[PDB]
Design a binder for this molecule. Sequence first.
Ligand SMILES: Nc1nc2c(ncn2[C@@H]2O[C@H](COP(=O)(O)OP(=O)(O)O)[C@@H](O)[C@H]2O)c(=O)[nH]1
Ligand SMILES: [Mn+2]
Ligand SMILES: [Mn+2]
Length: 608
Amino acid sequence: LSTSLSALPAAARDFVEEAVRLCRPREVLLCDGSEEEGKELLRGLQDDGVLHPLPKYDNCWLARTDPRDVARVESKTVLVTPEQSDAVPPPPPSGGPPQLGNWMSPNAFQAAVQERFPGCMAGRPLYVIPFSMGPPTSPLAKLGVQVTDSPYVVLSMRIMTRVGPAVLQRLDDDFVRCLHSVGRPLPLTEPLVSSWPCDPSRVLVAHIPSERRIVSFGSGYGGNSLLGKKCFALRIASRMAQQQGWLAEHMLILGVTSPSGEKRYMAAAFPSACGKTNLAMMTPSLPGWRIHCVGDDIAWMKFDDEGRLRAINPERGFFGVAPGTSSRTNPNAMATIARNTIFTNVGLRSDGGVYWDGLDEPTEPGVTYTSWLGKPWKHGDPEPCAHPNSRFCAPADQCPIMDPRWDDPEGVPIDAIIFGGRRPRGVPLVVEAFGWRHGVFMGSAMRSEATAAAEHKGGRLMHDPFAMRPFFGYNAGRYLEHWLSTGLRSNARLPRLFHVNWFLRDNEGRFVWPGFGHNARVLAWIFGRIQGRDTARPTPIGWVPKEGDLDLGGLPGVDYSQLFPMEKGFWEEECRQLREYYGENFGADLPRDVMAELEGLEERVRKM
Ligand SMILES: Nc1nc2c(ncn2[C@@H]2O[C@H](COP(=O)(O)OP(=O)(O)O)[C@@H](O)[C@H]2O)c(=O)[nH]1
Ligand SMILES: [Mn+2]
Ligand SMILES: [Mn+2]
């Protein structure tokens, strides 16, 4: 932290000064990303009562938030473009709410800003965060400057991005302008809940691609406040990617090593809270196999001149869902979060440790709990001890399984792309596409039960094409056409496309597939298919593994038949819904090739 801004280059200084003019902070501080800075930020937050120490561990901290500020708010997230059609497909003719992004005009946006931001930082410091996405480096690392009035956001940005001296030395005219405020100028007129500043009814997370700008107001929660992450690395970047010949995707990246010692890399698009983190740092239940983590959330991908799809992880940390994490489900996450980690909305134990449903950290008898509400909690209570969307925020270099190449500027070559979401019935454990166009169709057709990561009724089955529904930075029809065109790249070594489902439910009423480390059995088959092994049989929906080429050894309770349902009625209904969905939400912006693939599916279904 410093009061000198002189280290900022001209363009960055200009942006900071106009943000200072608008918001009227009490003082202005440049962040340097240092250890001493981190300590001073931690102390200040403990004073404010925002952070609580966790003495059981090494430099770990707990925040509790206002119950209204616990997740992303998709209905208050907008794309600001001169023309609506650049942001979103035609508004649904039946008049329902848009499902592929919310357009806001530049004029509506300017008005919205003038109603929220003037004097919003009164009595608060404005922190200047120069940051880099990817090694700074690299390239193609992309740099940004985030201003914020929240020390919590500063600390989280320091974990999740590179901040900020090697960043300062590279920073020029070329950068994202990220403006954030929790939107609670001092003095307060009404009290905070859990010392957590936020303005729920006034929340606005805006993206202005043509200005290389993000403007976020009223929320301190991760997806709304860590502007390099979803806002920049997905929304702004996907628009940049489309015009520059690359891809910015909601995808984990991992390395798989086979018993033969062969290593391949795979990307996987799952919706939020649908298994990316647990897969990316999985400990395989097949000991002849090895997994390495590259990233758990965002992938930037570009074909090299070898025609290979190269992927980097632009992030520096993990912002992972805590509930469910244990030495059974994710022992690699357990090792990662043991030190230098900020927890949000998890339980506090009387022994100075943390708690959530699933955690199996050895605890003494008579240990008591306080919930994310900050109130005493007991095994048996109506609600969970930890919020369903509670988080850990930990630096990636503390993961014991990081791929030797995880911060390699060149990227890793991708041989498989995997789509998947939560589907309780009908959709098999694993399917391989018949080819590129078909796999793009499968991606577009993705549906997944809503989770606690945003404002949707948990359990509601929702379309989520490419797991990108909340994160499109431009017209989703054009995004599909971009994916189609990508596969037409001359001499491209295309990855194979797959669709998985970890979440089929049995009768009754558990999960059919044990998942977690056992997902290595699926990845093994996928790797086999990459190697070109004759291990698949065709179905109306794509290739599936032959029974006997999918390793179910040591899973006596698990039946192949339940993993691979193939019911005509289900798929007839699915086609009907897809037809309805595309028509309402994509309209004329739906690529012909996607409709052609739907017609292909309906035709294969006719044969059943
Ligand atoms: N049943 C089951 N649950 C899983 C699996 N993988 C992850 N989960 C759970 O789903 C929730 C979200 O997991 P996570 O990997 O963090 O999702 P992400 O946000 O997509 O990275 C957590 O509570 C996990 O325990 C799986 O293979 N099977
Ligand atoms: Mn995500
Ligand atoms: Mn997660």
